Amino acid sequence: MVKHGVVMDVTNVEQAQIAEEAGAVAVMALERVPADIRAGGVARMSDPALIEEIMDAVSIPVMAKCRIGHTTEALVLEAIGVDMIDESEVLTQADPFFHIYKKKFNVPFVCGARNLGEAVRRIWEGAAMIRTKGEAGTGNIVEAVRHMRLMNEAIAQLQRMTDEEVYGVAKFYANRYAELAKTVREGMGLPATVLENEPIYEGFTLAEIIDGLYEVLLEVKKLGRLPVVNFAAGGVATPADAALMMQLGSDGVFVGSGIFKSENPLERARAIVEATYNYDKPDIVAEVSKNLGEAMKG
Amino acid sequence: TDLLKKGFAKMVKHGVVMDVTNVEQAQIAEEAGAVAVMALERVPADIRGGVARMSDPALIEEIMDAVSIPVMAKCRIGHTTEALVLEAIGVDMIDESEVLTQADPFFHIYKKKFNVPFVCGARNLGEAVRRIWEGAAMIRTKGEAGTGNIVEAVRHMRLMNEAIAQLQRMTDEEVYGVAKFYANRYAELAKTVREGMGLPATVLENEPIYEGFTLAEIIDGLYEVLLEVKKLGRLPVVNFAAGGVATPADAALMMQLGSDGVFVGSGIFKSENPLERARAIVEATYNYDKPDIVAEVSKNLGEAMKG
Amino acid sequence: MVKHGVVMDVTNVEQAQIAEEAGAVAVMALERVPADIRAGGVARMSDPALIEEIMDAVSIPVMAKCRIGHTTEALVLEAIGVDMIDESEVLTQADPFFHIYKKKFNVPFVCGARNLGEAVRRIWEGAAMIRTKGEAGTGNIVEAVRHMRLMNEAIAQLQRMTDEEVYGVAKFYANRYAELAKTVREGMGLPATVLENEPIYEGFTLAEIIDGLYEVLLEVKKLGRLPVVNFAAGGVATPADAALMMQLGSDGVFVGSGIFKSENPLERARAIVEATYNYDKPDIVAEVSKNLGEAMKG
Ligand SMILES: [Cl-]
Ligand SMILES: [Cl-]
Ligand SMILES: [Cl-]
Ligand SMILES: [Cl-]
Ligand SMILES: [Cl-]
Ligand SMILES: [Cl-]
Ligand SMILES: [Cl-]
Ligand SMILES: [Cl-]
Ligand SMILES: [Cl-]
């Protein structure tokens, strides 16, 4: 799994090679970048043939997207051998109630998160990497910033809590899993309530899910950060944007439309790669920003 | 004790426990056939203007020396020290009773750490389960002591029986839900104190609230007692009826409702012919399913109590 | 100041001598015990002559009551030389807005408290001893128990808080001091609000009072108990009652009506003294309880 650097979205062999040439740590194989996905009806997993061509074209890791909760799409990506699967909200959600139970898979997953509650639930489900996102395709960095701020402030507050108070937070975060059970009971003419000792997700009862989230939260509390790699995503369009996210605590960044939707892709890609690596060196970020050309509209 | 506590209780079942205020009454109770006596300075009917506390240990000892049957005594709810005193003088069983003036508004005595067995009152299943988890070796489905009106005792036994009948139709997961609801009463103090400090009246389930136990641990404890109740179809301890038993028919009625025995306070010594009355209630309790016997011992008993 | 034992209320030389004979650690000189005070219109400080006679009659410390907020009554007790002044709610309150500013006096004060908020405010004002009371004159121990329970549970919860959270509690407790200022502003046609930097009690602003309560609360947090001697009071009528309060954490007990309103005062007084000293010895409490006679009605 990738621990740092820039992950770029590519839609063909030429873009993947450019990404690898620019210094990307990995590429995200998809048929259409986020910006274009949002003209477009139902966005699904990309054709395995396209993903395999990109895999053959480069030496760095290749990732692919699958719809939220779409277990078979994920099993397919795992079968063709992608390095990491991204259960993304960029594509059209397939299961309105649950995300894939990622722990059962061998291939690692990266999941999006808007806040600590989402991150913890995603990590408990098995995510090996979190991408704190706001909204891809906009080219507006405010998205990623809002959520990284929310993520940092929540972890800072969690560190001031006793374990008992953290358990209380875990109990609050677990409630989302019982939405289906409550809706069903109501549909059967009964109160929209659930017993904490009845199975609701992958055989786990609400009480067991609470304990699972609690353990993840205790690690977050101990580390002062998420227990898995955390990249910022959505809105990164300039070298300064990438450097901003790194200063906010990100371990790396995802770039989709920002590069291939700009005037000089290869040039801008190198610059974002440089700014991410030298995020605390204003002169370098400044230099790589000179004469980059038109950025994505957004 | 553990096994010794329930051991004593099983030997009093099917009998009548009578309240006595002196050697003469205690003796009358014994010759009448009581299985045991409850020593106290004033019967519940008289208790109900001032503060009713534990009886002078000297009076209890005099009664213990006057009769060969076991002797019980009352202590105020939550009064750990009164209970410790009664245990030291050697009573056979302590009754943490609501007939006396409650001493602790938040908690009942933690009975499990005592050697002597306790009998506690209960108006419904929730109360019985909490008293039992606290250590009660015996339960008395109380009513309204001092009124001579059996309706209170009947109401609560009806509530107890119906709740147990509904509990048996539940899955273990559903029973846990009931245990969770029953445990909330223990967090009252914590919530009130938090509010007094300017914060939401809520509590964390892993913070200690009673005798070092957290809400979470209390729920598991109540859950285990409820499972026993479900398995047995009744309380896991001896359950006597108490309240307004004033006639032989009243005692027989409670037995038909499922009571293991009865407590009689004012109904005997606040009547015209104590000894005769006591004898009739004893026989009616032993032969609650014998209309002819119940009728027979009821004839020419004289005036009863009222209230 | 007294640190343990039994403080008894006496109304004459004979009772004081009995109290001293029984083993009291100190006596409370007053014209009428709490039980009788409540037939009775306005209850005030006792005649200095009666207090001086009791002082001469015994060798142990003598205390006297003064009305809440009655500074001159307190100065009088201090002038005749009482060992401790009890600003008690048993007497008719003299100042509806504030308690005496006890720090200015040389003689120590004992104040009542129903909960932690009251204890902290009283201690900040200068109290050298707190009596966690419920309601004297009733002979019903439930009063003292309720408040000792509230006191213990509040201190237990305070120990689980960070200093920042304790400051929040101090801020909440300080509000009571601004009641006068708010009432006055409203009477002048303006919003019932106050500025935290305006003087409201003894030259102290709300902000300074908050800091004062905060410091007291930090000591409570550090010690796991109040920073001054704490006796239980109100309702103690039997040796078992005294022993109960000691098991609940009290450093000692106050007894008023319980002794001289019973059948055998001297006998019952000795027994309560013994139970308080041997509160963890059931056999002794049991033995001293035998044949005590009639206790106070209540
Ligand atoms: Cl979620
Ligand atoms: Cl909780
Ligand atoms: Cl439940
Ligand atoms: Cl992080
Ligand atoms: Cl209860
Ligand atoms: Cl039963
Ligand atoms: Cl106050
Ligand atoms: Cl202000
Ligand atoms: Cl204390």
Swiss-Prot record, chain B:
Pfam families, A to Z: SOR_SNZ, ThiG
Keywords assigned by UniProt, alphabetized: Lyase, Pyridoxal phosphate, Schiff base
CDD domains registered for this protein in UniProt: pdxS
E.C. numbers: 4.3.3.6
Signal peptide: none
Gene3D superfamilies, sorted: Aldolase class I
The reaction(s) this protein catalyses: aldehydo-D-ribose 5-phosphate + D-glyceraldehyde 3-phosphate + L-glutamine = pyridoxal 5'-phosphate + L-glutamate + phosphate + 3 H2O + H(+)
GO molecular function, one term: amine-lyase activity
Function: Catalyzes the formation of pyridoxal 5'-phosphate from ribose 5-phosphate (RBP), glyceraldehyde 3-phosphate (G3P) and ammonia. The ammonia is provided by the PdxT subunit. Can also use ribulose 5-phosphate and dihydroxyacetone phosphate as substrates, resulting from enzyme-catalyzed isomerization of RBP and G3P, respectively.
Name of protein: Pyridoxal 5'-phosphate synthase subunit PdxS
Lineage: Archaea, Methanobacteriati, Methanobacteriota, Methanomada group, Methanococci
